[PDB]
């Protein structure tokens, strides 16, 4: 069986529907574009402050740990409020545990239209292949 990540939306997030993402292979977190649209079983979001290739999430069988990696995002990735890498820089793999608060992007105000676009803020639940919560 595959490891499983569940992304649930937090109150200060741009709204999204709960995601059930199986981690048979590493999963790209990123912004919706006609080639990839949001689905209940992916980590693609219709959120303008997310990068196209924002981050990667995967399960490592050797360590038994789950990892998140920022892949040169413009606006940042955060675990429990701690940023993974500077803008346009790649982070190392950073361990995530069930219950962690993961943020993709930051709020951005579009100055000419004076509309604030929220970021994605998620509680993540993580399950080992054997079903045990991480």
């Amino acid at each position: 069986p595959s490891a499983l990540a569940i992304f649930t939306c937090r109150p200060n997030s741009h709204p999204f529907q709960e995601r059930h993402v199986y981690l048979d292979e590493p999963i790209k977190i990123g912004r919706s574009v006609a080639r990839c649209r949001p689905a209940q079983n992916n980590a693609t979001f219709d959120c303008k402050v997310l990068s196209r290739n924002h981050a990667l999430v995967w399960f490592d069988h050797k360590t038994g740990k789950f990892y998140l990696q920022d892949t040169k995002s413009s606006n940042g990735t955060f675990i429990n409020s701690q940023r993974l890498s500077r803008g346009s820089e790649e982070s190392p793999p950073c361990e995530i545990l069930s219950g962690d608060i993961i943020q993709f992007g930051v709020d951005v105000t579009e100055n000419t239209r004076k509309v604030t676009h929220g970021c994605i803020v998620s509680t993540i639940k993580l399950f080992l292949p054997d079903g045990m919560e991480a």
Partner: peptide
């Protein structure tokens, strides 16, 4: 590309 940037 195309990201709304702070």
């Amino acid at each position: 590309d195309g990201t709304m940037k702070r």
